[model samples]
Target: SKGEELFTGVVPILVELDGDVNGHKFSVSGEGEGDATYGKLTLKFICTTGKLPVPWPTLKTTLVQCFARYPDHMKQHDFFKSAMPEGYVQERTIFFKDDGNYKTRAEVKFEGDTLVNRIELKGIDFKEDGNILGHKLEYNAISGNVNITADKQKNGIKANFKIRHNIEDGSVQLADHYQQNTPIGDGPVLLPDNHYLSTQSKQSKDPNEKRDHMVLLEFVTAAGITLG
Candidate 1:
């Protein structure tokens, strides 16, 4: 044989999700075609504010597809009432047959006991549509961190994370926040007690709150180019 050269399939990368969860203004889009030889992921989860828009499934496979759509009429009440225990605050709206625009909105409650999931999705295209849920494009295959949850009530807060990699600029640095300085005396000192996490992005205010929460905003995309 003459060496070897086969595997080839690149140019399937795109994840465009918007911002501001607790304040609305959402957006979730996707595209696929990963390389590692062969990998594909098609995604979409929207929420620029309202209207159940799901069908790209993710975020717990869209709540395990809500107990399997319905056994017989949503398994008889309460979004499938099987004794849903503790604080119970199950909201629903999971529909979409013809794509008809979009659908899939949720609100699964119970705080102190865990399971405080509030979801929102809307119209995801991903090149018209197609997402059975899969992952692998390995260009460094992201995710070492990206977990945001800070908002006490306005006071110099800024989280404008725009990730379009193709926006071109030699990307690298999707998220950051880890300052631990303690030299005191005359080197490092600027109030807020030398940072242990307090640059604003406040928190504290959850007494059975309804919507405007669960803003984890799951993130992902692949990139890392070379010279000419």
Candidate 2:
């Protein structure tokens, strides 16, 4: 079974609410292929709600904020660096730009024998000249769990996300929220309450019982979001 395929199909995304607020559910459907050493997966957001949950401007701002905050996260490994031509560092900061392409993209790459992997996405547009959103992902790989964080800022709104995936069960959780900095009667003031959303995937069949039990989360939301 060295080369045998495992999970390779759409991984459903489900959402539930703890409070009385309206809830939203959707799936990140795409093709996924992987084995022991290398794995590749792509997913697209299919908004079941009448309105798009994420807008271009919001995505762009969030990507920019995340890129700016974690510049080192985007760095490719030394093995992938030798192939790069010189004078690339100046443009390293900008990963996505506005172009003819009108699609959100996501990719996952696993390196060597390590269980750790990286996920990148082109979700929005650049403010000045580009056509796509420049964004990268940073995560800590540890036994039993992995945690990734992304952040962004636009106008007066700031957005942040923290996602956790259980390695053993393949279950995942994503927490998203936004805050606004506005001027008050005397001076600038931080908003009292911020907007928040949470999504988690439903549990898959037990991995021990099923070799193909892939990681997924039930999507759920309210004033805030949490997944387990």
Candidate 3:
């Protein structure tokens, strides 16, 4: 007789999202394996008002101009550093590996008027073990919002994440939670909070003036973290 390994093969999985932001609707979908090393993801952003604008130059250019115009506003919140060149619409991929922790890669491209981004993770044995996760990120220039989502199971725990950002207002909302059974507990102990955690900054009448207003609820939940 031969012994069998319970977790010996890969299981395929899919994740999707359909939501509206600032009046515009968007969706993201992806397919991957539970234990495999790669996957594909797609994102679609619809412009109800009109056609989407052309992809701009690198974030560096925008950051430099924004900082020069509004130094106080630019330094307020953390922003993505990746740069996407102008008129360059091709699939871009990035890979990474760590010391027995995880291996991952991401690819992005633009088609027609839609922007697509994808990320795949493998050999992730961190808090849990042997967990595979996929992510899709998109930035809406028309509305100045960035969206991200991750959905997959780790070990026996089901985990998911959704994050949204508003660049104009310097607002960010994070929705992350997990479900699992602990040895000493019943049901799932939701990590962090059950509801969405969001932070927003006030728009100053003058961009050069000191804009230092913080919300109490956001301050308490964020552990004194502020956008400015």
Candidate 4:
């Protein structure tokens, strides 16, 4: 404890996006906090280009910066060793009061010498009455990496992903494992792939699974980099 300072709670960190002169600038924002088990972080990035009246391609540069930073930014955390699998993919199931049970599958794969990662989750199932169902309604996928930087300040990351949902009429359908009972959304909805899967999964799965038949989003982090 002498030289090492413990993280007390949410430590605010800002991620910078580098882009062309005319395009948008985006950023992922987050804070690190001490949890009962390990340091926890809630991360998110929003496109700031629209706010500035800029060319679409120029605004696109932010994504590049984010993708570059993702690897080193994420791996430095202690949780990666436990959360990630060695060479192959790993699957996990989690439960919530409203959704019932859910699954989280993940793996870290090497893209040449650099390592990239992905996480997929199964959303919980529920009925019209708001009762918990045994089956999950949606399949969520997130894939991306954090690139470590030398300055430790300019580091950022990028990600790309897709979400699919199953449509069913009743509670039993919620429990049905049969692929035929599953429903897929009509289109691939796009979202910012800002390495914020944990938060988005929870919010999107909560009420939407109960009210909406099926909704899906495809998320991709603009290519970017992050500081170590």
Stretches > 4 Å off in candidate 1:
1-112, 129-141, 147-228
Model 2, stretches more than 4 Å misplaced? Answer: 1-157, 168-193, 203-217, 224-228
Least lDDT summed over 10 consecutive residues: which range in candidate 2? 83-92
TM-scores of the models, in the order given: 0.21, 0.21, 0.20, 0.23
| Global lDDT scores for all candidate models | 0.24, 0.22, 0.21, 0.26
* Per-residue lDDT of candidate 1, residues 1-228 (tens digit): 000011133323333443232233455433332231222222222333453232122222222111111112212211111212221222222222222222334443223422233445443322233221111111222222211222223211112121111112343322222211111022211111010111111112234744322221222211121222
Cα deviation at 145, candidate 3, in Å, is: 16
Residue-pair clashes per candidate, as listed? 9, 24, 0, 43
In model 2, the Cα lDDT at residue 41 comes to 22
Scored by lDDT, the top model is: 4
RMSD value for candidate 4: 18.3
Cα deviation of 23, candidate 1, in Å: 25
- Top TM-score hit: 4
**Which candidate, 2 or 4, would have the higher lDDT against the true structure?**
4
List residue ranges in candidate 4 displaced over 4 A. Answer: 1-88, 112-115, 128-228
State the local distance difference test value for candidate 2.
0.22
Decoy 1 TM-score against native: 0.21
